[PDB]
Amino acid sequence: ADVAGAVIDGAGLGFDVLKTVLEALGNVKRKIAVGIDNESGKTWTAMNTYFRSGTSDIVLPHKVAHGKALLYNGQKNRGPVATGVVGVIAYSMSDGNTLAVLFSVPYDYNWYSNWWNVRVYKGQKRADQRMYEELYYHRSPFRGDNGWHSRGLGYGLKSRGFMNSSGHAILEIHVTKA
Amino acid sequence: ADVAGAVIDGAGLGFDVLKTVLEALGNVKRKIAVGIDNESGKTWTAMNTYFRSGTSDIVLPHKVAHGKALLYNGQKNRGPVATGVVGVIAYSMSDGNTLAVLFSVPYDYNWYSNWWNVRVYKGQKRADQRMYEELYYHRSPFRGDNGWHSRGLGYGLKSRGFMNSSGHAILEIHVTKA
Amino acid sequence: ADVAGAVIDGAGLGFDVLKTVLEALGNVKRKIAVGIDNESGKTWTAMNTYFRSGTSDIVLPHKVAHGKALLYNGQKNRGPVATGVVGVIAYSMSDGNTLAVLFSVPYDYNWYSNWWNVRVYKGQKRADQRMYEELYYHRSPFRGDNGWHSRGLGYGLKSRGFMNSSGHAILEIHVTKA
Amino acid sequence: ADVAGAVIDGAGLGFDVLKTVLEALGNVKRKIAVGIDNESGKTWTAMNTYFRSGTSDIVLPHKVAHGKALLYNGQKNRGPVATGVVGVIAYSMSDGNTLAVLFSVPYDYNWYSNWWNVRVYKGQKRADQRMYEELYYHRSPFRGDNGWHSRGLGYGLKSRGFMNSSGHAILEIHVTKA
Amino acid sequence: ADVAGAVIDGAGLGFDVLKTVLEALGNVKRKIAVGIDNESGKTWTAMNTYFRSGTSDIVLPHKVAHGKALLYNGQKNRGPVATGVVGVIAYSMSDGNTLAVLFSVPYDYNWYSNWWNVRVYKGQKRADQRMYEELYYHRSPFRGDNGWHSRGLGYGLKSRGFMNSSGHAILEIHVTKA
Amino acid sequence: ADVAGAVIDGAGLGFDVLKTVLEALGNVKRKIAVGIDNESGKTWTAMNTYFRSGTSDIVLPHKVAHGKALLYNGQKNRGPVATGVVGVIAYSMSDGNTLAVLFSVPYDYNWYSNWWNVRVYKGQKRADQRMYEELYYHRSPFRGDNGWHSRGLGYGLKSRGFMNSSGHAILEIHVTKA
Amino acid sequence: ADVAGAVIDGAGLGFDVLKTVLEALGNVKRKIAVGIDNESGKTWTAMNTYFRSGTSDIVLPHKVAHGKALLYNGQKNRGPVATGVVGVIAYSMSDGNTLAVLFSVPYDYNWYSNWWNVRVYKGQKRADQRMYEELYYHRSPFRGDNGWHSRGLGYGLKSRGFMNSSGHAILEIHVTKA
Amino acid sequence: ADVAGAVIDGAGLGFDVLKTVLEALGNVKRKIAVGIDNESGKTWTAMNTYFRSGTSDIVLPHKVAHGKALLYNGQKNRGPVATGVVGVIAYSMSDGNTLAVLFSVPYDYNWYSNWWNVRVYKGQKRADQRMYEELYYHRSPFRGDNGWHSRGLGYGLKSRGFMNSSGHAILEIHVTKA
């Protein structure tokens, strides 16, 4: 009767609202483009990229020789999901150590910001949740605040990086001999 | 009367909801691009690709000589079907053995992940359901976790592969002399 | 009155449903691309293509010399019809025999699959319903299962063919000297 | 009152149905592309194309010398009309005879099929309704069944033609010296 | 009240019907492309084109030398008007006579057909309503029936023309020395 | 109540009708392209273009040397206004006289037609309302009837002009030495 | 109840009307393209452009050498605002004086017209509201009436300018040695 | 009942209004393009860009040698947020001082205007909120009023800058030796 018609009309209104909300959520773009210059004097072998959030549509370049550039990119999961792209790239270095690069492009910018970090681990370590937590919570990550930051990585290596503050984040790092 | 009008309005609302759901289901893309480099010293002859899920729109390359690359791709079945693209590619090798490559790009990522595996079978074996089950459940498949994995295939052969974690999966494998 | 208004509303809903169904049925694509390599040592003269289902928009190439390739294609009938493209191509060979190639890309994949077959008939025979039934039900057709199949055709001829399992089917056959 | 509102709603529904039907009828394409190779040893002068159904948007080529090809095309009448393109092309030959080519691409394929015919008439005769009836009902036209058909035209002339079975019909004929 | 609401609904339905009808009427295309080859041995000077129906968007070429071609085109009046393009082109010839070419592409093909005519008038006469009536009703115009028609124009001149039967009419005439 | 709802529905219908009418009025195109060839033996200096109706989006070419062509164009005012493009172009000539060219492409073709005129005024006179009235009502303007018209301008000058009858009017004039 | 439903329907109608009105207001284009040729024998240094209405999206060219052309453009403020583009460009001249060019492309053409003016001020003066008022109300601006106007600027300088009457206004001025 | 239906209709109207408002807010563009020419005789090293409002999608160029140009751009935050792009770029100079450039393109132009400023700070200072407040409230910023402004920066340096008044702001500065 009248109640059923009102319920159906309300359901249709809720359906339209849900369609609009889902389209808006799916139209949100959170992508990261990582470019790392290798002036470290040693060849880099890709180990893995651990994605705490998001994913990548391309192959992680297996080898990055000295004087070359690692080019990589990722983005948030397809669909109306309120997650960004957060991850750690782990490359094996010729000296036997691991270069770890943390990137974080969050979905909700009301509570979170773009973050990035670079660190060198002794031995060959694959990027995982523990490495991400170390780089994000305990190793003093740099804010993606459209600023250049330099930090000595050790092992005769230093890093100079930059990351913008937008959702279309670009993380450019130069890892050079210290 | 009023009841019939309410029923028709509810049916129209359900029709609109069903149209939206079917369009969303059909817009989901699950495709796999397989690239296998042959540095095994022997020529590969295509046997078959068994698709547990999905299909392919191209011909499986009949011959892959040493130093060449097998390029292949597949995708999930057209239409609003909640299935991914899961399959095994079987190539005959010159020594008389079979190279089997398992790929798995699931539809529902809440329960499943991207998987891949590489194995060498003695004799000439065509890819089928049993081979897929062996490669997916009992031969320790590698997760498609944006990481490089290496494993000795035996018969003087080793494999080094990579697979991303997204629905637009790329599986790059190098099968080289051990 | 109220009954007439309800009937008209139901008719409009049925009209919208019918429009959506017809559009979906018409958007289904079932096409076949046939490529046959002639390494038989004899020239092929086109006889005819009998379409059990579907049709073709191009001319069947009249002559296919040795070392050349027959290129042909067909698709299902235009409009919202639940039929695929099923047919037999009959070519006359220089020795006086007929090369018959059966292709079958069904509309309903719930009950049917892609099928193909190659056979050589003594004498000059045009493709028709009987030839299609022979090739589809009694001459052991190969499944379009993304696999390479080889079969001796006789008369000093062998065939090696491939057909994928999708609705956008490609049938590649090489008919060579045995 | 209520009756008038119901009548107006029904009229609107009928208007929508009529619009959809007219759009579907107008979207139906029936076109014919005629290509006739002249290896008859004599020049052909265009006489006329009588369209039993449909029309053409181009000029009938006035002269077709020996070794050249007549290219022509036509289509069904613009608008939502349930008629195909049926006609006869009449060319004058140098010997004083007429080459008549019948083409028929019907609108309703439930009752009709593609047909074509080739004939040589003594003297100079223009294509008309009587010639079309002769070629379609009494001179054994060839079915447009994706098959090659050969027939001796007489006067030291033979014809070898092909016509597909689809609505986008192509009629390729070679009229050569017998 | 209810009557006013019914009247407004009927007015809206009539508005939608009128919009559809006007769009359909405006989408009807009736254009003519005239190409006249001058092999008369004398130069042609444009006098005027009298449009009984329709209009032209280009300049009538002032001079057409011997061995050149007059290219002209016209179309029906813009907007939803049920009129075709009917007119007479009058060119002055070097000998002091007038070449008049009548073209007629009607809007309603249920009652009318494409017509064309060619005539030579003594003296310099501009195309007007009387000339159009003479060429259309009393000088035996040729039907635009996809046929070639030849007629001696006199004054040592003959004409050979062709006109298709469609609304996108092309009228090709060759006026040569008799 | 019911009256207010009926009033609102009628207002919405009137709004839709008004939107359609305004869109149709704004889609009406009335533009004029003027091309004047100067074979008068004297240089022309632009004085002004007085637009009785419409406007122009380009600069009136300041100088038109002998043997060159003045290219100009205008159109009706943007928006749903029922006005055409009517104006007079006044150029100063080297001898000290003024060349005035009247063009008139009306909006309503039910009452008005395309008109054009060419005149030479003694002295330097700028185009204005009085000059337009003189050229349109008292100096015998030529109708834009797709016809070539010639008239001696005096001062050792003659003009030969052409103007089509459509709303996309082109006015081509040649002002040459008499 | 019924009153609330009527109020909501009226509010929706008003919303649709407001959306249409705002779209129409925002679709109105009022832009000015200024081109000033410098044949004054002195270099021009840009001082500023004071926009009484509208704005510009480009940089005012800092230097305009003798024999070069200043190219500039502006437009009305983005959004549905009923304002045109009115401003004064002030350039510093090498002699120590200021060249001021007033342009005015109004929004409402029912009350206003295109205006322009050129003046030379002693000393270096920046364009402001007072300069605009002087050039628009007291220094006899030229109407943008598709006419060429010349005026001696003084200081051994004269100006010859042109401005059309449309909303897509072009103001071309040549400032030359007197 | 009736109340619930009225509430649902009002909610739908509010939803449509909110969708329109959000689309309008998101369609507002506020971007800044900064171009700074370095004729200071010293190399510039990027320190950081502090965005009080908005963000940037590109990397701040690390080095700007003498005679080169810094190219940078930013825009307001994506989505329907009523914020502009306001920030300070801080570059390190070879002499040990900092070049700070303030840009401000506000969202609400009813209360705010485009502003810019250039200053040199002793020592190496990173752009932050305090620097922005200093440059915007206490160091006399130049208005983005389409005017060229010059100011001695000190330390043997002077600046000459320009900024337009539109939301698509361009800020061009030349920092040269004083």
Ligand SMILES: CC(C)CCC[C@@H](C)[C@H]1CC[C@H]2[C@@H]3CC=C4C[C@@H](O)CC[C@]4(C)[C@H]3CC[C@]12C
């Ligand atoms: C009123 C009744 C029918 C309940 C309706 C619940 C709706 C509003 C809930 C149920 C499931 C929810 C979704 C569940 C998961 C996600 C993924 C997350 O990353 C973003 C939010 C999103 C997309 C939620 C949006 C809101 C949602 C659609």
Ligand SMILES: CC(C)CCC[C@@H](C)[C@H]1CC[C@H]2[C@@H]3CC=C4C[C@@H](O)CC[C@]4(C)[C@H]3CC[C@]12C
């Ligand atoms: C309320 C009455 C009419 C029953 C309605 C049942 C509807 C909701 C059911 C019936 C058949 C169902 C479909 C059957 C098969 C598939 C393929 C699967 O891979 C994804 C889901 C999908 C696409 C289902 C979606 C839901 C579905 C359309």
Ligand SMILES: CC(C)CCC[C@@H](C)[C@H]1CC[C@H]2[C@@H]3CC=C4C[C@@H](O)CC[C@]4(C)[C@H]3CC[C@]12C
């Ligand atoms: C219910 C009352 C108003 C009668 C409605 C009659 C309608 C359905 C009839 C009247 C005229 C008919 C049209 C008349 C002529 C043709 C051309 C033919 O080649 C195809 C069908 C077509 C296009 C008809 C379609 C149906 C039609 C539009």
Ligand SMILES: CC(C)CCC[C@@H](C)[C@H]1CC[C@H]2[C@@H]3CC=C4C[C@@H](O)CC[C@]4(C)[C@H]3CC[C@]12C
């Ligand atoms: C019911 C009341 C409001 C009367 C409605 C009358 C309508 C249907 C009439 C009035 C004026 C008519 C138009 C007048 C002139 C022409 C130009 C002609 O070449 C084609 C028909 C066309 C386009 C008519 C179509 C039908 C028309 C719009």
Ligand SMILES: CC(C)CCC[C@@H](C)[C@H]1CC[C@H]2[C@@H]3CC=C4C[C@@H](O)CC[C@]4(C)[C@H]3CC[C@]12C
């Ligand atoms: C019923 C009540 C609200 C009165 C409605 C009056 C409407 C129909 C009137 C009022 C103002 C009118 C417009 C006023 C001016 C012009 C410019 C003219 O060149 C073409 C007509 C046009 C565009 C008119 C169209 C009709 C119009 C919109």
Ligand SMILES: CC(C)CCC[C@@H](C)[C@H]1CC[C@H]2[C@@H]3CC=C4C[C@@H](O)CC[C@]4(C)[C@H]3CC[C@]12C
């Ligand atoms: C009537 C009941 C449901 C309350 C509705 C409140 C609506 C109108 C309010 C709640 C939250 C508000 C938004 C909150 C934040 C922002 C960001 C700001 O930069 C622009 C305005 C904007 C986008 C607001 C627009 C209006 C808004 C959507």
